[PDB]
Amino acid sequence: MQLNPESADLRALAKHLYDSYIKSFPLTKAKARAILTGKTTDKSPFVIYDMNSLMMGEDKITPLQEQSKEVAIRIFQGCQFRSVEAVQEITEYAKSIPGFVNLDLNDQVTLLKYGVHEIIYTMLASLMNKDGVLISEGQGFMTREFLKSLRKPFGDFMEPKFEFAVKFNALELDDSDLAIFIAVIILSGDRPGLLNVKPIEDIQDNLLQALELQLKLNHPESSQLFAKLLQKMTDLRQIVTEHVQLLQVIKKTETDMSLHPLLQEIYKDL
Structure with missing residues (x-):
């Protein structure tokens, strides 16, 4: 590769996406890793590792009907809420x-329709290590094992995200890598119900060039990092499919899991 006006434009495009990413996303991976390795002071987050720490931490860290449910549904609602504010941050970035x-x-609404879910899993990895995940913008940290202990089907909810993250986080991408990668994902031309594919594919070819030059510049030691990273866009399509398939079984048993707290109380009296 050469220093030239084409290489310079791709660097300027990467700079533009970073700064815009820094503005669109308060909690970055650099911030996250800091909190996770305890080399922060911003905040020492509250650790939820059991039912005890859940309730001790819920007070300290939602409508009134949704207030009073099984611990499972209260946390799932915390993920529905975050998933809704995540969508705005990504729409701002787009x-x-x-x-x-x-x-x-x-076409825009379409690209964000199917895009957001992949970005959320991509950026979720940033908040994750082998032990668990940063929640409430880095003020809590919920353990993988606590999340896995929850009542079915909820106890299977986060477990694929952890599996993805371990593999993803081993690529050791930073915020300048992730910025371009995320923009590559949003400008996906092979998506359902698009009028003009061509101009989406044109922007993406430029983004893919920008990404390649970013990864060569930023990761001298590793290699086929570019290809390994395009393969992840497949692991993401499969994870999304599994998430949605799961959300079907969870929107089917709507309030069978929130009733059983009260059926138990009525049972013990009887």
Whole structure:
């Protein structure tokens, strides 16, 4: 590769996406890793490792009907809430990608329809180590084992995200890597119900060039890092499918899991 106006443009495009990513996302991976390795002071987050620490930490760290449920559904609702504010941050980030807004506004909504879920799993890995996950913008940390201990089907909810993350986090990407990767994902041309594929594919080819040069510059030691990273976009499609398939079984047994607390109370009296 050479220093030239083409290489310079791709660096300028990467700089633009980083700064825009730093503005769109309060809790970055650098911040996260700091809190996770205890070399922070911003905040020492509250650790939820059992039912005891759950309730001791819930007070200290939602509508009124949704207040009073099985511990499972209270936490799941914490993930529904976060998943809704995550979508706005990503929509904010999407806007700052050269060419994105200048497309069919129906194509934009489509690219974010299917995009958001993959980005959420991508950025979730940033908040994760082998022991658990940063929640409530880094103020808590819920353990993998506590999450796995929850009532079925909920106790299977986060476990694939952890498996993805371990593999993903071993690539050792930083916020400047992830910024371009995330923009590559959003401008996916092979997505359902798109009018003008071509201009989405054009932006993405430029983003893929930007990513390649980023990974070569930023990861001298590792290699086929570029290809390993495009393969992850497959592990993500499969994880999303499994998440949605799971959310079907969870939106089917709507309040069978929130009733059983009260059926137990009525049972003990009887």
